[PDB]
Amino acid sequence: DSLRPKLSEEQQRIIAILLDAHHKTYDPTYSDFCQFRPPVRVNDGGGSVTLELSQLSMLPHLADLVSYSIQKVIGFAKMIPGFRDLTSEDQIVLLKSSAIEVIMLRSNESFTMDDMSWTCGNQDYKYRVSDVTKAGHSLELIEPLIKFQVGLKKLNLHEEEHVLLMAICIVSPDRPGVQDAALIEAIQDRLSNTLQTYIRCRHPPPGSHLLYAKMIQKLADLRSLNEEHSKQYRCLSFQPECSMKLTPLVLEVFG
Ligand SMILES: C=C1/C(=C\C=C2/CCC[C@]3(C)[C@@H]([C@H](C)CCCC(C)(C)O)CC[C@@H]23)C[C@@H](O)[C@H](OCCCC#N)[C@@H]1O
Numbered sequence: 001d002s003l004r005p006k007l008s009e010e011q012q013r014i015i016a017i018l019l020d021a022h023h024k025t026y027d028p029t030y031s032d033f034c035q036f037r038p039p040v041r042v043n044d045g046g047g048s049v050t051l052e053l054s055q056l057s058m059l060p061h062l063a064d065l066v067s068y069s070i071q072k073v074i075g076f077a078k079m080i081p082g083f084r085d086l087t088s089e090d091q092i093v094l095l096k097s098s099a100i101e102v103i104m105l106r107s108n109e110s111f112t113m114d115d116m117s118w119t120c121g122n123q124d125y126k127y128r129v130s131d132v133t134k135a136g137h138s139l140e141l142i143e144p145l146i147k148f149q150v151g152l153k154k155l156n157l158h159e160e161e162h163v164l165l166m167a168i169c170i171v172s173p174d175r176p177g178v179q180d181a182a183l184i185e186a187i188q189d190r191l192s193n194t195l196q197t198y199i200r201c202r203h204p205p206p207g208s209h210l211l212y213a214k215m216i217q218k219l220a221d222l223r224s225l226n227e228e229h230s231k232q233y234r235c236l237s238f239q240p241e242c243s244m245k246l247t248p249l250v251l252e253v254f255g
Contacts, residue, residue: 002209004200011194014081018163021079025072026106030120036064039124039131047133058134059245062127066103067247073102073170080167082187090178097175099253100229101222104145105166111149136236141228148221155214158203164195165215169222230254 007015037060044051077083077095086094110118118127132142157165173185199211233254236242243251 002200005197006201007194007197011197014191014194015160015164015198017079017081018167019159021076022159022163022166024079025076026109028109030110030122030125032068033065033120033125036068037061041131041134044130044134047130049138052133052136053239055134056136056239056242056245058131059136059242062131062135063246063250067249069103069106070099070249070253073099073106076102076166077170080171080187080191082190083171085187086183087179090180090184093175093177094170094172094184096253097177097226098170098172101169101226102166104148104222104225105152105162105169105218108149108152108162111153113150113153116146116150136239136242137232141225141232144228145225148218148225151221152218155211155218157215158198160198161195161203161211161215164191164198165218167191168195169219172219 039061040055040057042051042055042057074095077091083091083094107118110120112119116128120126129139129142129146132145133139168188168191171184171188171191173181173188178184195215196212200206200209203211237255
């Protein structure tokens with residue numbers, strides 16, 4: 001039965017805009033990483049919550065990484081068809097609430113199953129579980145995060161599906177504090193319809209009209225990661241002098 005409408009003119013334009021937005025906002029050569037505060041990796045095979053919190057050795061580097069990435073996500077979001085129709089208030093509510101989620105999704109591009117790390121072109125910029133603990137996070141966030149990255153990789157998304165997924169994440173009508181939920185939902189539906197249509201015309205075999213449900217379940221998983229991150233960030237923020245180690249944008253988004 002399984003009908004396969006072709007992508008409309010407009011849906012094809014939405015995909016090209018999203019791909020363009022992504023390519024303008026994600027440098028796959030990682031060439032800006034030398035501009036961040038440098039990574040420092042203290043000795044911590046233990047690897048000791050007391051010590052991690054005392055030093056927070058990887059925090060200035062990873063806060064700079066995330067802060068830069070939030071800036072990129074803002075730029076990506078402004079190019080999503082319809083985002084600019086939203087009030088400024090709703091734009092910002094959507095950005096602040098999705099930031100960490102979009103970062104976790106876009107990080108999949110540097111994540112490698114070779115060794116279960118985020119590898120950004122060189123061993124100074126390879127991030128492992130241990131480097132995240134050295135920024136003051138705990139295994140209750142990191143291990144589910146890695147499971148998420150693996151499950152995502154194993155979907156083998158086309159770049160089209162990947163950018164649609166990021167856009168769908170940002171334009172979510174159920175975020176706390178949004179005012180025009182209906183408009184946001186309309187924007188999201190246009191994107192969701194484009195993704196469903198895409199998978200059905202363009203993603204082979206296909207028996208896997210399972211993929212759209214799989215993608216949606218990733219969005220649910222990201223919600224869980226987002227709350228756990230928020231809880232841990234709050235604990236991190238109790239560490240004296242933590243704020244120095246962050247950035248103004250990070251502080252505003254998560255504080
Ligand atoms: C951030 C990205 C990358 C990796 C992402 C990682 C690996 C390290 C640990 C990180 C940061 C997790 C912790 C829990 C966040 C903690 C945040 C605070 C401390 C504020 O609580 C969440 C995502 C994780 C590299 C890369 O894929 C992109 O990098 C720059 C853009 C790439 C290009 N071009 C992407 O945006």
